[PDB]
């Protein structure tokens, strides 16, 4: 209980950094990421492989809403966590995939609730170590 | 003290020469199976198709016991390369995971070839200062 917390499946209606979502603590220096990583979020699917983010990868996330246009963010669209490249246009924000197989998500803040969970600051790829 | 960073390796100099260490990273080595011994900065996009982008720090377990299909660190005539090992017979090949790169054939009669170790994952962290 002393290192970076590891988040996997996120229930809907429950915060991401909820203790019931936390399934480990990895002893990895935070400041090795810039901004520093606050937690590791296991990535789902292949939407960001073109930048080397694969299913199973632990995305080192800085918890913040301080995210510029162009950066890769962790976002929550109607309770759903997604890791995409950001391009925010007033309250029509476009989340972009890094995989020409997927289409870019437009999310109307008039239609869905949208939260920026934090900035993507790296990945760790370790798999099963026991 | 933690895991050593290893950038480019000068020809004739060994890999883990203190001259080549560009840092120590505080990362639990037993978070990799088998455990990480050093992080090697990957150079180029030959392995992009499994997520190993150019610039990544590949976690590496120091060993020569490498099975085929495994992704390894190899030195072909003083040239460190990360590729997938195809041992199948008296035959051993270095396979990329990038359609624009051809397989590399290792003939131990033409080239000096050492298995530097096993890749047990990557750390993509970039510049932190």
């Amino acid at each position: 209980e002393e290192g970076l917390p590891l988040v996997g499946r996120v229930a809907a209606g429950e915060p991401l950094l909820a203790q019931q979502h936390i399934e480990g603590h990895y002893q990895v220096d935070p400041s090795l990421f810039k901004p520093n990583a606050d937690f590791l979020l296991r990535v789902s699917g292949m939407s960001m492989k073109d930048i080397g983010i694969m299913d199973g990868d632990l995305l080192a996330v800085h918890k913040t809403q301080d995210v510029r246009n162009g950066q890769v963010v962790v976002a929550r669209i109607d309770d759903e966590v997604t890791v995409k490249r950001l391009k925010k246009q007033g309250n029509k924000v476009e989340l972009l995939p890094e995989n020409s197989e997927f289409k870019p998500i437009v999310v109307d803040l008039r239609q869905q609730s949208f939260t920026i969970e934090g900035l993507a600051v790296g990945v760790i790829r370790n798999g099963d170590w026991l | 003290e933690g895991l050593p960073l290893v950038g480019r390796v000068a020809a004739g100099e060994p890999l883990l020469a203190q001259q080549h260490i560009e840092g120590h990273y505080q990362v639990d080595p037993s978070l990799f199976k088998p455990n990480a011994d050093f992080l090697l900065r990957v150079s180029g996009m030959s392995m992009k198709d499994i997520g190993i982008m150019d610039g990544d720090l590949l976690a590496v377990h120091k060993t020569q016991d490498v099975r085929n299909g495994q992704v390894v660190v190899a030195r072909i005539d003083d040239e460190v390369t990360v590729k997938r090992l195809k041992k199948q017979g008296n035959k051993v090949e270095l396979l990329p995971e990038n359609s624009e790169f051809k397989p590399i054939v290792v003939d131990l009669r033409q080239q000096s070839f050492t298995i530097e170790g096993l890749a047990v994952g990557v750390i993509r962290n970039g510049d932190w200062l």
């Epitope: 480990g24 603590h25 990895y26 002893q27 170590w129 026991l130 | 639990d28 037993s30 199976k33 088998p34």
Partner: nanobody, 115 residues
Framework: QVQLVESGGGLVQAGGSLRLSCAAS????????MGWYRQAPGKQRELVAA???????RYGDFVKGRFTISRGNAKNTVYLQMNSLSVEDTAVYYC?????????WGQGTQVTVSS
């Protein structure tokens, strides 16, 4: 070569708790990991908890905060504090160690949580 000695299983009434422990004899590298998988009759073997010699920890995705793995003041000994157990947690709980990429199993310790 490593020798793994389980203790602490048995029957528990749902909502109750029970602690498992493992001790690893033999040639133990400084760097290693230990913990528990588990196996319900019929299903496959699942990761429960794991812990490195250096303190890092991982839990299976059913644990949901409920369990806690820790290494003891003892050397090469971990305990798994299982709390809030559910009948669906009834399984055979094998202890596990790797070092250098080779695995080592325990004999198994059965845990029956009853309705």
């Amino acid at each position: 070569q490593v020798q793994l000695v389980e203790s602490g299983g048995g029957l528990v009434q749902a909502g109750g708790s029970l602690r498992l422990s493992c001790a690893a004899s033999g040639s133990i590298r400084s760097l290693n990991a230990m913990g528990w998988y588990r196996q319900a009759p019929g299903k496959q073997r699942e990761l429960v908890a794991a812990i490195t010699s250096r303190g890092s920890t991982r839990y299976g995705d059913f644990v949901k905060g409920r369990f806690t793995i820790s290494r003891g003041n003892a050397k090469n000994t971990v305990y798994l504090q299982m709390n809030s157990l559910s009948v669906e947690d009834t399984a055979v709980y094998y202890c596990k160690q790797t070092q250098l990429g080779y695995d080592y199993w325990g004999q198994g310790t059965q845990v029956t949580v009853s309705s």
